[PDB]
Amino acid sequence: KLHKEPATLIKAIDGDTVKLMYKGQPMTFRLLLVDTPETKHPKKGVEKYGPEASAFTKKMVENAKKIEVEFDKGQRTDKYGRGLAYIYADGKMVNEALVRQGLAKVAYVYKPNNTHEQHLRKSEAQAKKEKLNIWS
Numbered sequence: 187k188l189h190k191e192p193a194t195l196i197k198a199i200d201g202d203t204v205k206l207m208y209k210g211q212p213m214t215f216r217l218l219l220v221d222t223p224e225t226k227h228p229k230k231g232v233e234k235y236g237p238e239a240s241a242f243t244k245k246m247v248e249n250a251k252k253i254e255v256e257f258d259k260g261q262r263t264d265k266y267g268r269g270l271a272y273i274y275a276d277g278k279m280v281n282e283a284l285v286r287q288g289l290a291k292v293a294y295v296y297k298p299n300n301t302h303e304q305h306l307r308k309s310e311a312q313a314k315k316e317k318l319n320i321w322s
């Protein structure tokens with residue numbers, strides 16, 4: 187099945203991208219199955235709820251005692267060299283926490299890297315029926 191491995195926070199970049207020390211190497215990790223509003227790129231840019239999604243991920247990983255990464259069963263990095271994982275901060279999955287708050291939408295679902303897709307879609311449906319943030 188999937189397994190969690192330890193990692194150490196270096197820096198949170200924005201809502202869905204964080205830099206971590208993993209097995210002794212610095213890497214940027216991109217959260218599987220979600221897309222947060224942009225803070226960066228001019229062909230996207232500071233989007234509504236981008237500042238709040240970044241701050242939520244930053245708060246969540248900086249205050250954690252333990253960060254764990256869980257790779258899915260397909261490729262572990264994307265075309266930019268970013269690690270593709272589910273990230274956990276004291277056992278809470280950051281990717282699901284964002285979707286549950288309406289600060290991310292379920293996106294980039296590429297098989298076989300989709301083990302938690304239904305769990306995330308269930309949380310996104312709840313954030314939409316509660317009209318949270320993106321969905322308000």
Ligand SMILES: Cc1cn([C@H]2C[C@H](OP(=O)(O)O)[C@@H](COP(=O)(O)O)O2)c(=O)[nH]c1=O
Nearest residue numbers: 203216217218219220221264265270294296
């Ligand atoms: C989440 C994810 C993104 N990506 C790619 C798709 C997009 O490519 P392009 O940049 O060509 O559009 C980009 C989205 O990342 P960001 O949302 O960080 O921009 O990263 C993957 O290749 N695999 C993944 O699992």
Ligand SMILES: [Co+2]
Nearest residue numbers: 202221222223
């Ligand atoms: Co994004």
